[PDB]
Amino acid sequence: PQITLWKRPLVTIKIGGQLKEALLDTGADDTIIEEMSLPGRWKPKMIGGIGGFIKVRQYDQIIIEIAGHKAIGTVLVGPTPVNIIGRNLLTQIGATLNF
Amino acid sequence: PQITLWKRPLVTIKIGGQLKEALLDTGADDTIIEEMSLPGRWKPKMIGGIGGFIKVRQYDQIIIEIAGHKAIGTVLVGPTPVNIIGRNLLTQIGATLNF
Numbered sequence: 001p002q003i004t005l006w007k008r009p010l011v012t013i014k015i016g017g018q019l020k021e022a023l024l025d026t027g028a029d030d031t032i033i034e035e036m037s038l039p040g041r042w043k044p045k046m047i048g049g050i051g052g053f054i055k056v057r058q059y060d061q062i063i064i065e066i067a068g069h070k071a072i073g074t075v076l077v078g079p080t081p082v083n084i085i086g087r088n089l090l091t092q093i094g095a096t097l098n099f
Numbered sequence: 100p101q102i103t104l105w106k107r108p109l110v111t112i113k114i115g116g117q118l119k120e121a122l123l124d125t126g127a128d129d130t131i132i133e134e135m136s137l138p139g140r141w142k143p144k145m146i147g148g149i150g151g152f153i154k155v156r157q158y159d160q161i162i163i164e165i166a167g168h169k170a171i172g173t174v175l176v177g178p179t180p181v182n183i184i185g186r187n188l189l190t191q192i193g194a195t196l197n198f
């Protein structure tokens with residue numbers, strides 16, 4: 001698609017048997033969601049945002065469908081106020097920002 | 100241009116006759132610039148993301164040039180670690196996400 005930005009660019013994502021939605025976020029280096037069903041052990045990671053820094057749960061090799069496109073990569077679980085697809089996965093689906 | 104997302108999508112901006120650089124951020128609802136002087140009256144606001152909220156000054160109807168393209172709209176000023184062009188100004192230059 002060619003997505004305008006008058007509203008948040010939310011898309012359907014799928015992980016395992018869970019359908020969720022997430023914000024395509026060109027300003028995010030990494031993907032973060034609030035919850036993933038029964039995802040096993042993580043590795044701790046720190047990341048920054050505008051308000052300070054948060055502890056997150058790093059999961060590697062996650063198979064995730066994003067707007068109908070398959071990606072496989074790292075998904076963080078943490079206290080993000082909105083689920084975000086960051087550049088680590090945007091590049092896998094071939095997303096570009098155009099003007 | 101067509102901007103791939105293997106690195107942060109930073110572009111040149113001009114605001115207040117000053118050349119700066121900012122992140123094109125589809126995850127940001129509104130634009131936030133590091134501390135600088137802007138004309139007109141401002142209003143106090145707060146904005147939120149990862150790690151919580153920050154206090155900002157809201158300036159309305161500010162001219163800006165984003166990668167050579169003029170936009171006019173609301174600019175927040177405050178303690179962001181990176182200058183961010185959010186959707187309120189990305190829409191003014193016709194930016195889209197394409198995949």
Ligand SMILES: CC(C)CN(C[C@@H](O)[C@H](Cc1ccccc1)NC(=O)O[C@H]1CO[C@H]2OCC[C@H]21)S(=O)(=O)c1ccc(N)cc1
Binds near residue numbers: 086128130180183
């Ligand atoms: C978290 C989003 C819903 C909102 N944010 C925009 C977002 O793109 C920020 C924009 C951003 C970018 C750098 C530093 C701070 C904020 N990225 C971000 O927090 O990404 C984090 C996950 O990947 C990591 O890479 C960048 C920081 C980490 S935000 O900066 O908090 C923000 C919120 C509201 C407005 N109006 C403007 C900006």
Ligand SMILES: CC(C)CN(C[C@@H](O)[C@H](Cc1ccccc1)NC(=O)O[C@H]1CO[C@H]2OCC[C@H]21)S(=O)(=O)c1ccc(N)cc1
Binds near residue numbers: 145
């Ligand atoms: C972007 C900032 C300028 C926003 N300001 C937040 C304020 O707390 C700043 C935040 C702040 C902190 C340090 C440096 C700059 C701004 N403090 C400030 O201006 O302190 C002044 C008093 O001491 C002086 O030395 C520091 C600046 C001067 S603020 O305009 O007063 C304001 C207040 C409340 C809200 N919600 C929104 C805005």
Ligand SMILES: [Cl-]
Binds near residue numbers: 007
């Ligand atoms: Cl709509």
Ligand SMILES: [Cl-]
Binds near residue numbers: 010011012067068
């Ligand atoms: Cl979708």
Ligand SMILES: [Cl-]
Binds near residue numbers: 037038039040041
């Ligand atoms: Cl589990």
